[PDB]
Curated annotation (Swiss-Prot), chain B:
Assembles to form an icosahedral capsid with a T=7 symmetry. The icosahedral capsid is about 60 nm in diameter and composed of 415 major capsid proteins. The assembly is primed by the interaction between capsid assembly protease and portal dodecamer, and major capsid proteins assemble cooperatively to form the procapsid with the help of capsid scaffolding protein. Major capsid protein forms hexons and pentons of the icosahedron. Viral genomic DNA is packaged into the procapsid through the portal vertex. Belongs to the lambda phage major capsid protein family. It comes from Escherichia phage lambda (Bacteriophage lambda). The chain holds residues 3 to 49 of 341 of the full protein. This is Major capsid protein. It is found in: Virion; Host cytoplasm.
From Swiss-Prot, chain E:
It comes from the Viruses. This is Portal protein B. Proteolytically cleaved by the viral protease during capsid maturation. Belongs to the siphoviridae portal protein family. Coiled coil: none annotated.
Length: 49, 47, 53, 243, 54, 49
């Protein structure tokens, strides 16, 4: 809020604003998976006999 | 030194303020040349 | 409000005249012309002050 | 990755500074106006400034405080009708009234009177169209429709103090007023040497920018004004603080 | 449409043209004349008759 | 066809439930009234039919 200083004396200089930073850098994910063809001999729930 | 920072957009944090009075009741403005003002209210009550 | 300058070439590199400076240089090296009033400014200012008084 | 010249940085800094200066000036005038047509009595004072008083001439009956026997809450929300009290507060105004400007907390209580809720749907007995289920949320002032001769508008305006923001209007108040009501935004003559030299004292705002002398020279940016917003007829408006 | 031509003219004194609500002049708003970036005028704020002054 | 009332004389008449229920028939009355007064803060006002 601006002040009601009388038009005679002076005014205190208000600070200039600004300044805020942050970092959220890396992130990662890796869902490893394989096939292992050993179990392919057994039939799936699909693929009727 | 060797950090390689990349900057994204910056939020402003706007402050809400709407007069709703200067444009609803105070539509007229007058400058000064003198140091004071006079306001006249004329009471008309005829019998 | 803050005052900002800008550099302008006198002419385009393709030969087009971007800017035009027209004046009568009294002596060589006169980059800026002087108005003709310069020789009579005081002698007309004092005249009009005399008229008012 | 994309820097900029510190000269341009200073330019945008000064632009932002002027912007916040203008905001600070505007909120002062808005506070002036809300005090003026909220109570009529309006004083300005502060550190390094003599207090100054302003009486518009508002009468006692234009600043009705509901406190009494059956002010607003103990009245049953079911059968009671606030329109009678609205008429009672409107009559002692000496002027046409067409706005019932409201607080964002008292309007819920006003709507709580189911009399008006049923008055909405008559199909032959009320053209007053209200908009409940607020049509503007998380924003500035919001209209609510029409209440016959009078328009309903709800204000959420906030002014900032030295460090904290707070609502202009009090917790639960309302004001009946006229669109045609005349209000002045008078600006006094600027009491500055430069302004008096320029003959520009009669101005709403006075921006300024200079640089001090001396080797550690520094620039100074300024805005000044002499706002004395008033209104010809305080008695036109009626202020009621609810309970 | 009674007249063949439907164009009329009003000459306006500059005293009737000024800044709306007597606001301060800006880069593009000057004495009620809204101009563009290049300086060409875009709009004018015309004030209604002030007689009587009430 | 003229039933003009007093500013407070009309209040008690309006307060009755009978006028409100008469305003809600959808097939029994074409009367057009206006509660939540549509003309206040000034002189005499028509209240409809």
């Amino acid at each position: 809020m601006a002040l009601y200083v009388s038009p005679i004396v002076s005014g205190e200089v208000i600070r200039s604003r600004g300044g805020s930073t942050s970092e959220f850098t890396p992130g990662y994910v890796k869902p490893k998976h394989e096939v292992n063809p050993q179990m392919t001999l057994r039939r799936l729930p699909d693929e009727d006999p | 030194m060797y950090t390689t920072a990349q900057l994204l957009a910056a939020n402003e944090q706007k402050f809400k303020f709407d007069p709703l009075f200067l444009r609803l009741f105070f539509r007229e403005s007058y400058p000064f040349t003198t140091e004071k003002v006079y306001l006249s209210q004329i009471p008309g009550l005829v019998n | 409000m803050p005052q900002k300058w800008t550099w302008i070439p006198r002419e385009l590199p393709g030969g087009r005249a971007s800017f035009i400076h027209v004046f009568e240089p009294v002596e060589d090296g006169q980059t800026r012309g002087a108005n003709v009033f310069y020789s009579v400014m005081e002698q007309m200012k004092m005249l009009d002050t005399l008229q008012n008084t | 990755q994309n820097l900029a010249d510190p000269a341009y940085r200073r330019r945008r800094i000064i632009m932002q500074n002027m912007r916040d200066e203008e905001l600070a000036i505007a909120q002062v005038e808005e506070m002036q106006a809300v005090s003026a047509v909220l109570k009529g009595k309006y004083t300005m004072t502060g550190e390094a400034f003599d207090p100054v008083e302003v009486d518009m001439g508002r009468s006692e009956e234009n600043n009705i405080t509901q406190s009494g026997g059956t002010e607003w809450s103990k009245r049953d929300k079911s059968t009671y009708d606030p329109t009678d009290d609205i008429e009672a507060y409107a009559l002692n105004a000496s002027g046409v009234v067409n706005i019932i400007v409201f607080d964002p907390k008292g309007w819920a209580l006003f709507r709580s009177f189911k009399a008006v809720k049923e008055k909405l749907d008559t199909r032959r007995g009320s053209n007053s169209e209200l908009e409940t289920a607020v049509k503007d949320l998380g924003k500035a002032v919001s209209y609510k429709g029409m209440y016959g001769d009078v328009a309903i508008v709800v204000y959420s305006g906030q002014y900032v103090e030295n460090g904290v923001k707070k609502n202009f209007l009090p917790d639960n108040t309302m004001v009946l007023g006229n669109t045609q009501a005349r209000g002045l935004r008078t600006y006094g003559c600027i009491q500055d040497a430069d302004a008096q030299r320029e003959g520009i004292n009669a101005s709403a705002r006075y921006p300024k920018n200079w640089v001090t002398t001396g080797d550690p020279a520094r620039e100074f940016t300024m805005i000044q004004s002499a706002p004395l917003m008033l209104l010809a007829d305080p008695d036109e408006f009626v202020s009621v603080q609810l309970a | 449409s009674s007249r063949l031509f439907r164009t009329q003219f009003r000459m306006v004194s500059p005293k009737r043209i000024s800044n709306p609500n007597n606001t301060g002049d800006s880069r593009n708003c000057r004495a009620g004349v809204q101009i563009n970036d290049s300086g060409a005028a875009l709009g004018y704020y015309v004030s209604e008759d002030g007689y009587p002054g009430w």
